[PDB]
Amino acid sequence: GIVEQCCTSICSLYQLENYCN
Amino acid sequence: GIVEQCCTSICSLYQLENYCN
Amino acid sequence: FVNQHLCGSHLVEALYLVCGERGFFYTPK
Amino acid sequence: FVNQHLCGSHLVEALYLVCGERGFFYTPK
Ligand code: NA
Ligand code: NA
């Protein structure tokens, strides 16, 4: 999930946008 | 939605919790 | 902190604090 | 602001800024 992608690893715009509605 | 309940009117715990997963 | 007008980042913050590990959805429009 | 480790309120903030009026879902667990 987002925590694995963005908190424990370096986030990206690409990944953040996966969690926009 | 949440903006109507919490931004343009006074928010509440009760309403916030409606938007928890 | 919840019993006030909360807009934008201020509203997102309150959701974050209240919902905890449950998480939340923020749908402004 | 997005290309870093972001946790907790810092992550929620980035979602808020990037997603805009679309909104977002934050599911930590
Ligand atoms: Na608290
Ligand atoms: Na921006």
Strands (E), chain B: none
Residue among D1, A12, C19 at smallest CA distance from A4: A12
Q: Is the dihedral of CA D1, D6, D10, D13 positive or negative?
A: positive
Q: How far is the CA of D18 from the centre of ligand 2 (A)?
A: 6
Q: Experimental method used, please?
A: X-ray
- CB count within 10 Å of CB C14 equals 20
Return the structure tokens found at C8: 């934008």
Q: Are residues B2 and C18, on separate chains, in Cβ contact within 8 Å?
A: no
CB D13 within 8 A of CB C26: no
Q: Residue C8 sits in which domain range?
A: 1-29
| C-alpha distance from C15 to closest chain B C-alpha (Å) | 6
Distance (Å, rounded) from C-alpha D10 to C-alpha C25? 16
Distance (Å, rounded) from C-alpha C15 to C-alpha D11? 13
Domain count, chain D: 1
Distance (Å, rounded) from C-alpha B11 to C-alpha D1? 29
Q: Are residues D26 and C26, on separate chains, in Cβ contact within 8 Å?
A: yes
Q: How far is the CA of B13 from the centre of ligand 1 (A)?
A: 11
Any idea which residue has 């949440």 for tokens? B2
**What Å resolution does this PDB entry report?**
1.2
Q: Are residues A12 and D22, on separate chains, in Cβ contact within 8 Å?
A: no
Q: What residues of C are in contact with residue B8 (Cβ under 8 Å)? A: 5
Coil, strand or helix: which one is D15? Answer: helix
Residue type, C9: S
Kindly report the backbone phi and psi dihedral angles of residue D7, in degrees, each rounded to the nearest multiple of 5, phi listed first: -130, 150
